[PDB]
PDB file of all heavy atoms in Angstrom:
ATOM      1  N   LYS J   7     -20.441 -14.434 -39.512  1.00  0.00           N
ATOM      2  CA  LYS J   7     -20.135 -15.146 -40.739  1.00  0.00           C
ATOM      3  C   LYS J   7     -19.848 -16.618 -40.463  1.00  0.00           C
ATOM      4  O   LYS J   7     -20.271 -17.485 -41.222  1.00  0.00           O
ATOM      5  CB  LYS J   7     -18.959 -14.499 -41.455  1.00  0.00           C
ATOM      6  CG  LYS J   7     -19.164 -13.057 -41.845  1.00  0.00           C
ATOM      7  CD  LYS J   7     -17.870 -12.496 -42.383  1.00  0.00           C
ATOM      8  CE  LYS J   7     -18.094 -11.169 -43.072  1.00  0.00           C
ATOM      9  NZ  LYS J   7     -16.802 -10.579 -43.534  1.00  0.00           N
ATOM     10  N   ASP J  76     -15.002 -33.690 -25.691  1.00  0.00           N
ATOM     11  CA  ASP J  76     -14.940 -35.060 -26.163  1.00  0.00           C
ATOM     12  C   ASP J  76     -13.489 -35.515 -26.115  1.00  0.00           C
ATOM     13  O   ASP J  76     -12.583 -34.700 -26.238  1.00  0.00           O
ATOM     14  CB  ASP J  76     -15.486 -35.189 -27.586  1.00  0.00           C
ATOM     15  CG  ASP J  76     -14.653 -34.426 -28.607  1.00  0.00           C
ATOM     16  OD1 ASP J  76     -13.996 -33.440 -28.223  1.00  0.00           O
ATOM     17  OD2 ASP J  76     -14.696 -34.806 -29.783  1.00  0.00           O
ATOM     18  N   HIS J 122      -0.705 -40.096 -26.986  1.00  0.00           N
ATOM     19  CA  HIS J 122      -1.348 -40.424 -25.729  1.00  0.00           C
ATOM     20  C   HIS J 122      -1.084 -39.430 -24.606  1.00  0.00           C
ATOM     21  O   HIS J 122      -1.835 -39.429 -23.621  1.00  0.00           O
ATOM     22  CB  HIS J 122      -0.900 -41.807 -25.235  1.00  0.00           C
ATOM     23  CG  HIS J 122       0.590 -41.918 -25.058  1.00  0.00           C
ATOM     24  ND1 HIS J 122       1.180 -42.048 -23.819  1.00  0.00           N
ATOM     25  CD2 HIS J 122       1.601 -41.908 -25.951  1.00  0.00           C
ATOM     26  CE1 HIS J 122       2.482 -42.125 -23.953  1.00  0.00           C
ATOM     27  NE2 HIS J 122       2.774 -42.044 -25.247  1.00  0.00           N
ATOM     28  N   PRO J 209     -12.013 -18.835 -44.253  1.00  0.00           N
ATOM     29  CA  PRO J 209     -13.397 -19.087 -44.670  1.00  0.00           C
ATOM     30  C   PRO J 209     -14.095 -17.887 -45.245  1.00  0.00           C
ATOM     31  O   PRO J 209     -14.899 -18.017 -46.169  1.00  0.00           O
ATOM     32  CB  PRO J 209     -14.062 -19.561 -43.360  1.00  0.00           C
ATOM     33  CG  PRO J 209     -13.226 -19.002 -42.293  1.00  0.00           C
ATOM     34  CD  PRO J 209     -11.817 -19.071 -42.819  1.00  0.00           C
TER      35      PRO J 209
END
Side-chain angles (χ1 to χ4, degrees):
Chain J
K7 300 173 167 177
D76 63 335
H122 59 111

